[model samples]
Target: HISSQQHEKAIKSYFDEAQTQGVIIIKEGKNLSTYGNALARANKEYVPASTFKMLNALIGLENHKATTNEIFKWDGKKRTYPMWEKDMTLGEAMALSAVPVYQELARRTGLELMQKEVKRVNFGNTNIGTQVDNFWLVGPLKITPVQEVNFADDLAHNRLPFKLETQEEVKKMLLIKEVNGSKIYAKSGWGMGVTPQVGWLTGWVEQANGKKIPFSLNLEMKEGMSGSIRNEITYKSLENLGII
Candidate 1:
């Protein structure tokens, strides 16, 4: 079952408080959309931003370009994001959302292998467009929130086309934290390539009863919107739905 009328009111209240427009999709064992606006927004496609790292990381591991334990060296070129300046293992790089590390991994994976994997997974549009390394961030490649929810559900259940071990490895690295009695695993993304920057928090919750609830939330942000709002809404929404 999903949330009740009171739950929907609370979700809308939270999103209103955050001053943002977006979508939130959560389900267990099915694709029941609890919010009308969320259902509509979930169908709208947008640049995937750092959320693409999840797939890139999977491809990297699949192609032997990166390992869970291997440390990726920083180029010292100093990007705008301070966290990208230091070396870190694949695990740490993923936790930090280090763009350069994944960019390097994509380069190593090369366009051919990346395209092949994207097509194999039938991910998003599967249109890498022109840019090999940065297509997911700023190019034609895009994914909707509905697709995110489906992908996350597959990932949580180890049902993607990749090997079981590969999916498990990537999922192992996506843990955000354990809350209440549930374990929350997810990745958050921020994109600035469009008019209004976008944010996403997508993943699943593993309850104590061994049930998994998948979710995906994406919101638009202005110049100064808090980056944490996406996670905040997801957490509150799950709580409202009595899933956490």
Candidate 2:
């Protein structure tokens, strides 16, 4: 069992507060396996936002659509399709929160093809459709906290239903983790369903010796808050959990 002692009582107290507001946390690494009710609720099938971009990029590369370095011209233009139509690279599209690029990618791949690939990855109990851009916040799809962890585990271990080539490409896109001497990869999902805002974070953290850790955290709270709030909570969680 993962040691709860590794996480202090103060941290647990923080988690108690999180539990009341629809936040869920999952830790799945060496000596660190635990879950809470708050996470279960937050991940209870909500729109995946930019996190789905991982699948979009994977499918695009597998289908021979985009080169690793091929850049898409943004032209400082906003495409009316996803509302925020800015220029982006296939890589940057996944990194930044650009809706137009993903919409175009979805258009190129079509609903059928993308759906097939998303299902192949065994995403949560949600629909995967062609209109993938504008719905970044509350799309036709959603993911549970448990499923989020499951999918990241599959991706990191190369056990998805698809070929390993595509999975490897997805894993390589995470280069920022080296700065901190850890193999950290993550995606933030933000969506608004009805009135309240929703937030989701999913990724894997790898140690330098090649030992791997996988996890997924999700939250749903009041809408209209700034992204800074999300980032603050995210970093706070990471730091408290010793992920930073």
Candidate 3:
């Protein structure tokens, strides 16, 4: 059961106000609380998009495919996201959501090793499909919001099989910015090809009291609806919990 009914009400109110099809799942310790059409949306998996970068980074680190200091040179391949056009270290690539850098990392990591890591972590669906490098973005590689929250909870507590150092390094790269007295570590994913343009904001908040709250928010974006909607809704949810 949710520890606070008031928080649940606040989340539902925010989602309703946004008028978006989304799921917000918050896990504090072993208890789970949700708002919106959470059960329905959380049960149905969707393309994880760049959110998979977090997992891919972990696999890269664990397999020695890449390191925090390793700089990946741009192939001069003009890409969609502008920030991805130059050389980038693991941290820079992640902060900019550089797809090519991680795609190269995926190619180097290979399908076999990537699959092994995904299965070991019990990542959603565990199906890399035929598109080894592009599976997470295109199709077949999918994860539900609930699964995302569970994976994040593991990440928050360093429960994955990776070395403690490796997990800590990846966590550092995922940090967004500190808010009030809380530090928020998160990753946002935008699924362009998917209908309505799915968006995801998944991560955890470390409070001043040392409490941890892991959350996942997945929503559909309306036409021309861009900007900071992902973080906006997520921060609103966090605020509803009185964490910010």
Candidate 4:
């Protein structure tokens, strides 16, 4: 826990150079260290976008809307991405960020049950609107990066108000990769067909020693910027801080 503040400056430019605004919050034990518009943006709320799929999956499991391996056959509808055009399991949907499958999961859950669970968990504004499926995608529902970390930390520790089994299933779905001995679990998102789109990477890193570093990063997608900017800044910050 020592340094000149030079890197904090670099973290700010992590957004600045991209001509975007964003924030990252890494909760290391009790200290909530924020970088890039540290105080303000970290607390600013935005639509959870596909990041909501993390919770959607949990609710989907709890209500038997779907299971990790439940097959969701494609409806033969055209999709923007070629990869999303095939049949996939719930696990594959999570990994693929396949919007339609999860939307179907939410549709199955319906507004009544989905609202019950969202309120039970006290997620973001708990505002799903009347739209059973698209509220989180296009919101009145929103979550701050700070709240994203808390939710991830809770789920990581098995402390969320959900059955342990459901939490475990969702955890299994969130696995993105293993780096060295650390198991990284995360979801990335782009806001619903919106301009200056917002992107997200939300989840935790399970370190070999049992420590979990929960992080949430969201960036405004400036016109000419690559989507990978969210990942680039986040992993670099964790690396710079030696979290990996």
Best by TM-score: 1
Q: Give the alpha carbon lDDT tens digit for every residue of 1-244 in model 3.
A: 3567666676766666777778888898898777764447877888999899999999999899987998899988789877788999988888899988999999999988888888888899999976678988878888999899998999989998889998999999998979978999988998888775778999999888888899988888777776487788789878767767
lDDT of 2 by residue, 16-39 (tens): 555424453545543334443353
lDDT of candidate 3 vs native? 0.85
Candidate 1 lDDT by residue in tens digits, 1-244: 5537777778888888888787788877885575523447778788888889889989889878878899888777877788779988877888988888888898999998888889899888888975678888786888988889899999999989888999989999999978878999999998887766778898999999989999989888788787888888888888888889
Better of 2 and 3 by lDDT: 3
* TM-scores of the models, in the order given: 0.95, 0.78, 0.93, 0.94
lDDT, candidates in the order shown: 0.84, 0.63, 0.85, 0.85
Superposed model 2: Cα runs more than 4 Å off: 1-9, 12-20, 27-39, 79-86, 129-136, 175-179, 221-224, 228-231
TM-score of 4: 0.94
Error of 1 at 30 (Å): 1.7
What's the lDDT for residue 103 in model 4? 90
Determine which window of 10 residues in candidate 1 has minimal summed lDDT. 31-40
lDDT of 2 at 9: 46
